[PDB]
Ligand binder design. Sequence first.
Ligand SMILES: OC[C@H]1O[C@@H](O[C@H]2[C@H](O)[C@@H](O)[C@H](O[C@H]3[C@H](O)[C@@H](O)[C@H](O[C@H]4[C@H](O)[C@@H](O)[C@H](O)O[C@@H]4CO)O[C@@H]3CO)O[C@@H]2CO)[C@H](O)[C@@H](O)[C@@H]1O
Ligand SMILES: OC[C@H]1O[C@@H](O[C@H]2[C@H](O)[C@@H](O)[C@H](O[C@H]3[C@H](O)[C@@H](O)[C@H](O[C@H]4[C@H](O)[C@@H](O)[C@H](O)O[C@@H]4CO)O[C@@H]3CO)O[C@@H]2CO)[C@H](O)[C@@H](O)[C@@H]1O
Ligand SMILES: OC[C@H]1O[C@@H](O[C@H]2[C@H](O)[C@@H](O)[C@H](O[C@H]3[C@H](O)[C@@H](O)[C@H](O[C@H]4[C@H](O)[C@@H](O)[C@H](O)O[C@@H]4CO)O[C@@H]3CO)O[C@@H]2CO)[C@H](O)[C@@H](O)[C@@H]1O
Ligand SMILES: OC[C@H]1O[C@@H](O[C@H]2[C@H](O)[C@@H](O)[C@H](O[C@H]3[C@H](O)[C@@H](O)[C@H](O[C@H]4[C@H](O)[C@@H](O)[C@H](O)O[C@@H]4CO)O[C@@H]3CO)O[C@@H]2CO)[C@H](O)[C@@H](O)[C@@H]1O
Ligand SMILES: OC[C@H]1O[C@@H](O[C@H]2[C@H](O)[C@@H](O)[C@H](O[C@H]3[C@H](O)[C@@H](O)[C@H](O[C@H]4[C@H](O)[C@@H](O)[C@H](O)O[C@@H]4CO)O[C@@H]3CO)O[C@@H]2CO)[C@H](O)[C@@H](O)[C@@H]1O
Ligand SMILES: OC[C@H]1O[C@@H](O[C@H]2[C@H](O)[C@@H](O)[C@H](O[C@H]3[C@H](O)[C@@H](O)[C@H](O[C@H]4[C@H](O)[C@@H](O)[C@H](O)O[C@@H]4CO)O[C@@H]3CO)O[C@@H]2CO)[C@H](O)[C@@H](O)[C@@H]1O
Ligand SMILES: *[C@@H]1O[C@H](CO)[C@@H](O)[C@H](O)[C@H]1NC(C)=O
Ligand SMILES: *[C@@H]1O[C@H](CO)[C@@H](O)[C@H](O)[C@H]1NC(C)=O
Ligand SMILES: *[C@@H]1O[C@H](CO)[C@@H](O)[C@H](O)[C@H]1NC(C)=O
Ligand SMILES: *[C@@H]1O[C@H](CO)[C@@H](O)[C@H](O)[C@H]1NC(C)=O
Ligand SMILES: *[C@@H]1O[C@H](CO)[C@@H](O)[C@H](O)[C@H]1NC(C)=O
Ligand SMILES: *[C@@H]1O[C@H](CO)[C@@H](O)[C@H](O)[C@H]1NC(C)=O
Ligand SMILES: *[C@@H]1O[C@H](CO)[C@@H](O)[C@H](O)[C@H]1NC(C)=O
Ligand SMILES: *[C@@H]1O[C@H](CO)[C@@H](O)[C@H](O)[C@H]1NC(C)=O
Ligand SMILES: *[C@@H]1O[C@H](CO)[C@@H](O)[C@H](O)[C@H]1NC(C)=O
Ligand SMILES: *[C@@H]1O[C@H](CO)[C@@H](O)[C@H](O)[C@H]1NC(C)=O
Ligand SMILES: *[C@@H]1O[C@H](CO)[C@@H](O)[C@H](O)[C@H]1NC(C)=O
Ligand SMILES: *[C@@H]1O[C@H](CO)[C@@H](O)[C@H](O)[C@H]1NC(C)=O
Ligand SMILES: *[C@@H]1O[C@H](CO)[C@@H](O)[C@H](O)[C@H]1NC(C)=O
Ligand SMILES: *[C@@H]1O[C@H](CO)[C@@H](O)[C@H](O)[C@H]1NC(C)=O
Ligand SMILES: *[C@@H]1O[C@H](CO)[C@@H](O)[C@H](O)[C@H]1NC(C)=O
Ligand SMILES: *[C@@H]1O[C@H](CO)[C@@H](O)[C@H](O)[C@H]1NC(C)=O
Ligand SMILES: *[C@@H]1O[C@H](CO)[C@@H](O)[C@H](O)[C@H]1NC(C)=O
Lengths: 307, 307, 307, 307
Amino acid sequence: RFAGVNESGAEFGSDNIPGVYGTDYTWYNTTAMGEFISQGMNIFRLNLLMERLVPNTMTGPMNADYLGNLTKDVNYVTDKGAYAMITPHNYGRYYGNIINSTSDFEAFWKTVAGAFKDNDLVMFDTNNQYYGMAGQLVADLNQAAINGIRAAGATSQYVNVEGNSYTGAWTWTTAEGTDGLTNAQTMGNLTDPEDKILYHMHQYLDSDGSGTSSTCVNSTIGATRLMDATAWLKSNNKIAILGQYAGAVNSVCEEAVEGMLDYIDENSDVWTGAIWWAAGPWWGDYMFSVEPDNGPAYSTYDPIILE
Amino acid sequence: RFAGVNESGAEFGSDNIPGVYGTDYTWYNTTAMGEFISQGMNIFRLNLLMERLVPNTMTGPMNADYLGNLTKDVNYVTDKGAYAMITPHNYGRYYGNIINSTSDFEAFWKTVAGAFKDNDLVMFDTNNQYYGMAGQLVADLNQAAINGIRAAGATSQYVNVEGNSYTGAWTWTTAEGTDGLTNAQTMGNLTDPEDKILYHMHQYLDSDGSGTSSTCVNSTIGATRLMDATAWLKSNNKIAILGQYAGAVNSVCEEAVEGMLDYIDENSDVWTGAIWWAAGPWWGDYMFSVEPDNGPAYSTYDPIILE
Amino acid sequence: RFAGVNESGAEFGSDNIPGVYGTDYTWYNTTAMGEFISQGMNIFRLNLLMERLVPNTMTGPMNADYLGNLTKDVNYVTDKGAYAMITPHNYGRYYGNIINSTSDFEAFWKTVAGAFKDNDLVMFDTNNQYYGMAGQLVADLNQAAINGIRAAGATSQYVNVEGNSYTGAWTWTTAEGTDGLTNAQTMGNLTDPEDKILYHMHQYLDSDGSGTSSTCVNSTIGATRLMDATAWLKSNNKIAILGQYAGAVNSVCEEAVEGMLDYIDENSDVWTGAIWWAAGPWWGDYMFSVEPDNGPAYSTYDPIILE
Amino acid sequence: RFAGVNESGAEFGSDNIPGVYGTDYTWYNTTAMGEFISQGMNIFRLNLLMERLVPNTMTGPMNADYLGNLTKDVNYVTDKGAYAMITPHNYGRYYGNIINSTSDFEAFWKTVAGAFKDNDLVMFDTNNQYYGMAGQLVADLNQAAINGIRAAGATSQYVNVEGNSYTGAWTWTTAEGTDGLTNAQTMGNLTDPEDKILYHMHQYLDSDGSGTSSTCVNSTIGATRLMDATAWLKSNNKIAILGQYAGAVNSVCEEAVEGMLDYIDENSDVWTGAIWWAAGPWWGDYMFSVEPDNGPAYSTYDPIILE
Ligand SMILES: OC[C@H]1O[C@@H](O[C@H]2[C@H](O)[C@@H](O)[C@H](O[C@H]3[C@H](O)[C@@H](O)[C@H](O[C@H]4[C@H](O)[C@@H](O)[C@H](O)O[C@@H]4CO)O[C@@H]3CO)O[C@@H]2CO)[C@H](O)[C@@H](O)[C@@H]1O
Ligand SMILES: OC[C@H]1O[C@@H](O[C@H]2[C@H](O)[C@@H](O)[C@H](O[C@H]3[C@H](O)[C@@H](O)[C@H](O[C@H]4[C@H](O)[C@@H](O)[C@H](O)O[C@@H]4CO)O[C@@H]3CO)O[C@@H]2CO)[C@H](O)[C@@H](O)[C@@H]1O
Ligand SMILES: OC[C@H]1O[C@@H](O[C@H]2[C@H](O)[C@@H](O)[C@H](O[C@H]3[C@H](O)[C@@H](O)[C@H](O[C@H]4[C@H](O)[C@@H](O)[C@H](O)O[C@@H]4CO)O[C@@H]3CO)O[C@@H]2CO)[C@H](O)[C@@H](O)[C@@H]1O
Ligand SMILES: OC[C@H]1O[C@@H](O[C@H]2[C@H](O)[C@@H](O)[C@H](O[C@H]3[C@H](O)[C@@H](O)[C@H](O[C@H]4[C@H](O)[C@@H](O)[C@H](O)O[C@@H]4CO)O[C@@H]3CO)O[C@@H]2CO)[C@H](O)[C@@H](O)[C@@H]1O
Ligand SMILES: OC[C@H]1O[C@@H](O[C@H]2[C@H](O)[C@@H](O)[C@H](O[C@H]3[C@H](O)[C@@H](O)[C@H](O[C@H]4[C@H](O)[C@@H](O)[C@H](O)O[C@@H]4CO)O[C@@H]3CO)O[C@@H]2CO)[C@H](O)[C@@H](O)[C@@H]1O
Ligand SMILES: OC[C@H]1O[C@@H](O[C@H]2[C@H](O)[C@@H](O)[C@H](O[C@H]3[C@H](O)[C@@H](O)[C@H](O[C@H]4[C@H](O)[C@@H](O)[C@H](O)O[C@@H]4CO)O[C@@H]3CO)O[C@@H]2CO)[C@H](O)[C@@H](O)[C@@H]1O
Ligand SMILES: *[C@@H]1O[C@H](CO)[C@@H](O)[C@H](O)[C@H]1NC(C)=O
Ligand SMILES: *[C@@H]1O[C@H](CO)[C@@H](O)[C@H](O)[C@H]1NC(C)=O
Ligand SMILES: *[C@@H]1O[C@H](CO)[C@@H](O)[C@H](O)[C@H]1NC(C)=O
Ligand SMILES: *[C@@H]1O[C@H](CO)[C@@H](O)[C@H](O)[C@H]1NC(C)=O
Ligand SMILES: *[C@@H]1O[C@H](CO)[C@@H](O)[C@H](O)[C@H]1NC(C)=O
Ligand SMILES: *[C@@H]1O[C@H](CO)[C@@H](O)[C@H](O)[C@H]1NC(C)=O
Ligand SMILES: *[C@@H]1O[C@H](CO)[C@@H](O)[C@H](O)[C@H]1NC(C)=O
Ligand SMILES: *[C@@H]1O[C@H](CO)[C@@H](O)[C@H](O)[C@H]1NC(C)=O
Ligand SMILES: *[C@@H]1O[C@H](CO)[C@@H](O)[C@H](O)[C@H]1NC(C)=O
Ligand SMILES: *[C@@H]1O[C@H](CO)[C@@H](O)[C@H](O)[C@H]1NC(C)=O
Ligand SMILES: *[C@@H]1O[C@H](CO)[C@@H](O)[C@H](O)[C@H]1NC(C)=O
Ligand SMILES: *[C@@H]1O[C@H](CO)[C@@H](O)[C@H](O)[C@H]1NC(C)=O
Ligand SMILES: *[C@@H]1O[C@H](CO)[C@@H](O)[C@H](O)[C@H]1NC(C)=O
Ligand SMILES: *[C@@H]1O[C@H](CO)[C@@H](O)[C@H](O)[C@H]1NC(C)=O
Ligand SMILES: *[C@@H]1O[C@H](CO)[C@@H](O)[C@H](O)[C@H]1NC(C)=O
Ligand SMILES: *[C@@H]1O[C@H](CO)[C@@H](O)[C@H](O)[C@H]1NC(C)=O
Ligand SMILES: *[C@@H]1O[C@H](CO)[C@@H](O)[C@H](O)[C@H]1NC(C)=O
């Protein structure tokens, strides 16, 4: 049901907060996004920075200029019938410190979700790639995000919940948090009064699953890396989405990507779709970029994403 | 919609204030302007000096002789259906000092607009090429100019707003004022009770975009230099006009001018036209002069402007 | 709302079709209308002949020279913000024959309106002073004209609809067509998808209301002749304009004219204004000419029109 | 050389004849006129209505109360050495109807001039601003007034004679009466056995010379608008006074008024002075009121009148 791209740029220059628009970060190219929608993609994951959207304190007001831009780009996507996922690209951290106030995190999500409560083509993504924290805390932070989003009256939207350890699909049942707990051990019991939780997992294809290398391990590394997570999803009657994945321009990465997408299809009772990492107007010759006018990966993987 | 020429001559000799009409400065050749109007040009940017139009203090009265000459040239253009844009050619400075009193600047513009409030073919250009100031001040000055012009009851006219750093298109998003701010971040904020703001940018084709050299960088320098500004104008839902541009009599410059005007036409949702620099009766063999009886550039670029 | 003058002269020499410009007919003195607009008049009823605008057959093309002059005068007026009413001074006849083809009449008006569809200060005036026909036919012709005007895409302009029997206000409810039917019986049912129908009546002040004698019956003859139509307009929720009226230069006429305009003022809920008959450059010493440079009625009635 | 103001107020509320003193009209503030006199002004044009001084028929007796008040104000002015102009503010009409009986007009003026025959500081002003009449009849009425004034034995007073078309100076040789004759063609053969005829013209400075707009055409409009009349006065060996003129309180009007007053000085061989319109006690905020305590024009133009 979901096939699309990440939009990355509004979280750029994370070293400069708030940073300057047009120098440190940018918002997304709606012309490109419209082309993607015309070709048939129906989801765009819009990445942003917590500290730019709500400066200083998570319980604070929203910056008007940053929120309007977020809203402009969101409306463009949803006005044309595609889903817009709102993703604070913060790794579970605020101003560089692990978010450990669930009360504060809930307040932040009530604030944000309030701004989009009536848009049923919006999705909320609680935080991009929690890492290096207690497994229990990561679960509690997802739950606090759900609480805040629903408390704001946003009841039609799916909430993407992300695991610890960069929410990696291949390590769902193995990677351990600072408390010794895995994602499989802590993420299952999340509850939602609207029962629209989407488990949100990421999967890269190089040795360490980081996406640093342009070398994919082998032609089947993708599908085989989703198997453990797939079993867990079925076992616990959950559904999921692959929020980030990519491979470089070579024949082994291409096959591995095609195979992993084929697998999501054969297991589409638990997998709902996949979102490429990534699009955006400031990527230059980034090896994973599918931005249309200059993304080096566009010509190869645009057709594959369309299936 | 708009295609025409600058008229420059009444701002000449700006080291002599008030100077002597006929010796330091002159007004414009209406016979040549009528010829241009017959060929089909429909805008004339009439340059002048703030200090000659309102001497001593910019809250003061208008010099009758200078204002009378200005009105005569304006009425000649507008009686024949072409636009006449009134351009204080002052770089954001009055008697050589940066204009830092937005109150005073609003009063100047209420004074001037008052003299043309019922001519709906008049354009108001807040000031030619602000440079070397704060970006916020330049924006605030443009705003104070809009406020003054409307307060005078001049409600039908477009107000041309010019940015800092010589309002260059190619640097709209990168060049910084004395406060590190760029035109992009500061100039969007402007509002107009009559929603008739026209962003007014200039584009030269030599290496430093100063128009000093007869050599244009290459055959595609114009179009490629309008791209950044064009993105900004679409993203921010604004419209603009290229108020100054030129190239010299050689094949590379000529091809460069053609390419940038073709680009303007392709992107005519945001670009409304372009005004050549320049015409006028005292240019002699100035490389960029398209004055009909005299201008080395007339035979080459007059046809190109007409399209 | 509307206060102005007829312009008469392009329909002169009705006995010579096509006739010769400058011999049989003329167009209007823009300098004269410019003065009227300075004074505050905001409507000019521009009279012409259908046969000179659309020669030979009502379905045909327009005559370019006659159309060119009409658009010149129209544009001069509307460019200064006044309304220009376009009026075929044809009495319901075409080449002297009563117009029976509602199909051709609609085609004629679609052609004419097309040339002015985007000028939202034009008004269309279906035909001057129908007379000697069936009441129902006059209504049908007015409806056909409305249909054609709207079908040409002229949706912003008022359509002035004129009744039978010289569209006299004083006989609106009494004078019968050749079918025994009055204007009040037949003109109520006119429809317009833009809801911009302006009922267009005329009122002279001599015994037989023909406006051919300089004697006005008495000092209140004007307002009293309007009361029957005023009641019909209120009872039928229509609005109207007095497209022609005149008194001669004498005290009883002057008083009678003021009293009627005063009446129109007090009944402005249904009377939108009044248009004097007439201005124009070829009237000489016509009893009713308010042409400034030589109209005998100017000094008396110019101030009265302005209120 | 005469320099002073109009007194206007006893002619107010001209729609109520006789009207009620203190409700419809008033007489003048002698204390304010004494002030004007001590500053050096030496002429006061006292406006009234024929019908309130001589009711019912022009051959009738005077109204004691209205005459008594006129006599009070006249005597206050002349007892301090200043001239008092007696001016019926009637536009050549009696009870609203144009005066056709030169016999009655002469009788009216004989009656009025008798009440003042020995006061050699009074002037008589045959009627204010004839308009819309035959030029020959306006001349005949001025002669009849002269004839009646002298027949009364009032042989020392100047008789101010006013032309047709609002006795406008700028139209003296161009505006035609209903008989096709101008003031220049008809006003030149008036005779006086005492040879004290003063030609009495009016000049406002707005576009249509109506004196009803606060905008003056330009800084020289007053002087240029008097030159046709000056050449006529010089060539026909007549002398004149400008019995009404005014500008609003704005820089253009101020210069126009000043320049016209210098023109009169430079042409004092034919122009004897100028009377401002206007002073008086019920003007309130009238744009031309030079009434001391109340008049918005007093501060600016009081000094200008005094020279
Ligand atoms: O491009 C015109 C614009 O550029 C501005 O400078 C840009 C640099 O051109 C650009 O290289 C840089 O982009 C960085 C970005 O800052 C990082 O935040 C981002 O980090 C990526 C990371 O590299 C990926 O591996 C990971 O997967 O994702 C994160 C993002 O979530 O990497 C990119 C690309 O290397 O950003 C600069 C601005 O911050 C100029 O300043 C401006 O003037 C120009 O107009
Ligand atoms: O996914 C995109 C995300 O990646 C981040 O990079 C992460 C990888 O996501 C993550 O998988 C990787 O995990 C490493 C881990 O750090 C090592 O400690 C562990 O080492 C294993 C070893 O492989 C075993 O052989 C040995 O027996 O045990 C040790 C552990 O005891 O290996 C895993 C992967 O195999 O770490 C990466 C970062 O270091 C990026 O940083 C981020 O930017 C991307 O968005
Ligand atoms: O022409 C007869 C007239 O000449 C007067 O002297 C003239 C010079 O002849 C004329 O060259 C000179 O023109 C200068 C002008 O002073 C500068 O202000 C102007 O600056 C230009 C600049 O050169 C351009 O590169 C830039 O794009 O624009 C600015 C203007 O905005 O440059 C011109 C040409 O170099 O002006 C003199 C008067 O000021 C005589 O005095 C007189 O007697 C003669 O009748
Ligand atoms: O446009 C008509 C107007 O031009 C004026 O001439 C201006 C140019 O318009 C302006 O673009 C140019 O700007 C220079 C700037 O001063 C330099 O500091 C800068 O140098 C860059 C360098 O290129 C980079 O490599 C490095 O990073 O440092 C700096 C960036 O910080 O380069 C630009 C060149 O584009 O300056 C000209 C002179 O002021 C005319 O003066 C005026 O008369 C014309 O009307
Ligand atoms: O002779 C000079 C000039 O005249 C042109 O024709 C003029 C007529 O001179 C002028 O009287 C006439 O004014 C008409 C107007 O056209 C009608 O719209 C209006 O209709 C009358 C109708 O004529 C009467 O018979 C009838 O009873 O009623 C209506 C009004 O209720 O009446 C006015 C006058 O009252 O306009 C003509 C031009 O349109 C000649 O064409 C030209 O050649 C001559 O040089
Ligand atoms: O003040 C107390 C008094 O007021 C009476 O009401 C007065 C109004 O106060 C007064 O403003 C109004 O004045 C009119 C006057 O009626 C008109 O006749 C006169 O016409 C002017 C015209 O405005 C000029 O444009 C033209 O040039 O000249 C003529 C004059 O010749 O205009 C003035 C102002 O518009 O008159 C009212 C009375 O008639 C009260 O009724 C009374 O009770 C109060 O005590
Ligand atoms: C925006 O996307 C369109 C469509 O791919 C592309 O043509 C255009 O160049 C992009 N704009 C920028 C500024 O990158
Ligand atoms: C986007 O951000 C810029 C800079 O902060 C701001 O000026 C602009 O108004 C924003 N856009 C919207 C739609 O708010
Ligand atoms: C969370 O971080 C706080 C700092 O805000 C610190 O006291 C401690 O590490 C944690 N406290 C709680 C209550 O979780
Ligand atoms: C691909 O690599 C993974 C991880 O090393 C391994 O489990 C899998 O068997 C490999 N597949 C093939 C076909 O070599
Ligand atoms: C004015 O322009 C005309 C037409 O281009 C030209 O012939 C004439 O020489 C010019 N006059 C001057 C003084 O430059
Ligand atoms: C233009 O200025 C000159 C120099 O003072 C002056 O003589 C001339 O009158 C002015 N022209 C107009 C139309 O005012
Ligand atoms: C404007 O500039 C002058 C110096 O150039 C400075 O003294 C003054 O305080 C400034 N005004 C403001 C409001 O900053
Ligand atoms: C921005 O614009 C608003 C309204 O146009 C104005 O009140 C404000 O002072 C401006 N300032 C900045 C920094 O944008
Ligand atoms: C022209 O020069 C500019 C600046 O050096 C460059 O960006 C552009 O690519 C050049 N165009 C061509 C066709 O080489
Ligand atoms: C045109 O109108 C002007 C303004 O009233 C007038 O002065 C002029 O005489 C008219 N021209 C003709 C040819 O009637
Ligand atoms: C007006 O009509 C005359 C006669 O045909 C023609 O010469 C002239 O070009 C016309 N004017 C316009 C503006 O079409
Ligand atoms: C129009 O009216 C009737 C149709 O009912 C017909 O007899 C008459 O001849 C027609 N006349 C013209 C001029 O069309
Ligand atoms: C004016 O004349 C009309 C028609 O004869 C008449 O109905 C009306 O009563 C007259 N008015 C007066 C006041 O006699
Ligand atoms: C009469 O004039 C005097 C002197 O200007 C002034 O003080 C007083 O208010 C005036 N009275 C009236 C009723 O206008
Ligand atoms: C002025 O008129 C009033 C009202 O009729 C009257 O009472 C008063 O006596 C008159 N004044 C003089 C001096 O006659
Ligand atoms: C006299 O007044 C009558 C109105 O009763 C008018 O018709 C006439 O024109 C006037 N005088 C002359 C000489 O015509
Ligand atoms: C002032 O206006 C008059 C009338 O339009 C005109 O004749 C005269 O030339 C104008 N004066 C100036 C200096 O423009």
